[PDB]
Structure 1
Amino acid sequence: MIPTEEALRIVFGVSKRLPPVIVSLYEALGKVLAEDIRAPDPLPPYPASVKDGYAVVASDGPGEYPVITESRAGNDGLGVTVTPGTVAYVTTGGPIPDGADAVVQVEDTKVIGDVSKRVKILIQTKKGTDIRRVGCDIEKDATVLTTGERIGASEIGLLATAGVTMVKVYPMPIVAILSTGDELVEPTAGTLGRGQIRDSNRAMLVAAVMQQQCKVVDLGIVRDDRKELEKVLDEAVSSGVDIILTSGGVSMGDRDFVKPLLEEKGKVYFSKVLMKPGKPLTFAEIRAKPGKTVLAFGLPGNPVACLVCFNIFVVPTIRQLAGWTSPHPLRVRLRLQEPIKSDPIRPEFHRAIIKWKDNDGSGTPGFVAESTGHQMSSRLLSMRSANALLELPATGNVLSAGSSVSAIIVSDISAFSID
Structure 2
Amino acid sequence: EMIPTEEALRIVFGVSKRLPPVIVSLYEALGKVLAEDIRAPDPLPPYPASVKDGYAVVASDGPGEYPVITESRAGNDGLGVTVTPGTVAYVTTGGPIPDGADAVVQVEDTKVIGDESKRVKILIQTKKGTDIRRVGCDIEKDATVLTTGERIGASEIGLLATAGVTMVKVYPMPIVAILSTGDELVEPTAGTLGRGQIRDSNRAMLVAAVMQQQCKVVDLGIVRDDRKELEKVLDEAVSSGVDIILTSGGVDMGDRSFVKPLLEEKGKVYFSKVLMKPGKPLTFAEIRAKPGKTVLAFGLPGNPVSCLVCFNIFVVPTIRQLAGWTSPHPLRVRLRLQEPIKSDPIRPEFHRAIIKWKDNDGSGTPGFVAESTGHQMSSRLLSMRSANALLELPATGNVLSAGSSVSAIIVSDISAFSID
Contact preservation (8 Å) 2:279, 2:310: no
Tell me, in whole angstroms, the C-alpha distance in 1 between the residues paired with 2:416 and 2:96.
42
- Cα displacement (A) at 1:75: 0.2
Any idea what the Cα deviations from partners look like across 1:144-181, whole Å, max 9, x if unmatched? Answer: 00000000000000000000000000000000000000
- Cα displacement (A) at 1:350: 0.2
- Cα displacement (A) at 1:295: 0.2
- Cα displacement (A) at 1:131: 0.1
The secondary structure found in structure 2 opposite 1:229 is: helix
- Cα displacement (A) at 1:251: 1.8
- Cα displacement (A) at 1:115: 2.8
Any idea what the Cα deviations from partners look like across 1:249-296, whole Å, max 9, x if unmatched? Answer: 012110000000000000000001011113101100000011100000
* RMSD, aligned α-carbons: 0.4
Tell me, in whole angstroms, the C-alpha distance in 2 between the residues paired with 1:18 and 1:212.
16
- Cα displacement (A) at 1:233: 0.1
Tell me, in whole angstroms, the C-alpha distance in 2 between the residues paired with 1:324 and 1:331.
17
Any idea what the Cα deviations from partners look like across 1:99-146, whole Å, max 9, x if unmatched? Answer: 000000000000000131000000000000000000010000000000
Tell me, in whole angstroms, the C-alpha distance in 2 between the residues paired with 1:291 and 1:404.
48
Any idea what the Cα deviations from partners look like across 1:39-79, whole Å, max 9, x if unmatched? Answer: 00000000000000000000000000000000000000000
Any idea what the Cα deviations from partners look like across 1:209-234, whole Å, max 9, x if unmatched? Answer: 00000000000000000000000000
Aligned length: 419
The secondary structure found in structure 1 opposite 2:379 is: coil
Any idea what the Cα deviations from partners look like across 1:3-37, whole Å, max 9, x if unmatched? Answer: 11000000000000000000000000000000000
Task: Determine the structure 2 residue equivalent to 1:353.
Answer: 354
Mind listing any 5+ residue stretches in structure 1 that lack a counterpart? none
Tell me, in whole angstroms, the C-alpha distance in 1 between the residues paired with 2:334 and 2:87.
64
Contact preservation (8 Å) 2:3, 2:273: yes
Task: Determine the structure 2 residue equivalent to 1:220.
Answer: 221
Any idea what the Cα deviations from partners look like across 1:185-212, whole Å, max 9, x if unmatched? Answer: 0000000000000000000000000000
Tell me, in whole angstroms, the C-alpha distance in 2 between the residues paired with 1:251 and 1:155.
45
The secondary structure found in structure 2 opposite 1:157 is: helix
Tell me, in whole angstroms, the C-alpha distance in 2 between the residues paired with 1:368 and 1:279.
27
The secondary structure found in structure 2 opposite 1:246 is: strand
Tell me, in whole angstroms, the C-alpha distance in 1 between the residues paired with 2:396 and 2:189.
44
Q: Which runs of 4+ in 1 moved over 6 A?
A: none
Task: Determine the structure 1 residue equivalent to 2:248.
Answer: 247
Tell me, in whole angstroms, the C-alpha distance in 2 between the residues paired with 1:245 and 1:115.
78
Contact preservation (8 Å) 2:32, 2:152: yes
The secondary structure found in structure 1 opposite 2:168 is: strand
The secondary structure found in structure 2 opposite 1:390 is: strand
Task: Determine the structure 2 residue equivalent to 1:176.
Answer: 177
TM-score (norm 2): 1.00
Task: Determine the structure 2 residue equivalent to 1:337.
Answer: 338
Tell me, in whole angstroms, the C-alpha distance in 2 between the residues paired with 1:66 and 1:305.
78
The secondary structure found in structure 1 opposite 2:214 is: coil
Any idea what the Cα deviations from partners look like across 1:334-383, whole Å, max 9, x if unmatched? Answer: 00000001111110000000000000000000000000000000000000
The secondary structure found in structure 2 opposite 1:280 is: coil
The secondary structure found in structure 1 opposite 2:312 is: helix
Tell me, in whole angstroms, the C-alpha distance in 2 between the residues paired with 1:155 and 1:36.
12
The secondary structure found in structure 2 opposite 1:140 is: coil
Tell me, in whole angstroms, the C-alpha distance in 2 between the residues paired with 1:84 and 1:364.
61
Contact preservation (8 Å) 2:11, 2:270: yes
The secondary structure found in structure 2 opposite 1:274 is: coil
Tell me, in whole angstroms, the C-alpha distance in 1 between the residues paired with 2:49 and 2:360.
48
The secondary structure found in structure 1 opposite 2:272 is: strand
Contact preservation (8 Å) 2:279, 2:309: no
Tell me, in whole angstroms, the C-alpha distance in 2 between the residues paired with 1:155 and 1:215.
23
Tell me, in whole angstroms, the C-alpha distance in 2 between the residues paired with 1:273 and 1:330.
21
Tell me, in whole angstroms, the C-alpha distance in 2 between the residues paired with 1:75 and 1:306.
63
TM-score (norm 1): 1.00
The secondary structure found in structure 1 opposite 2:344 is: coil
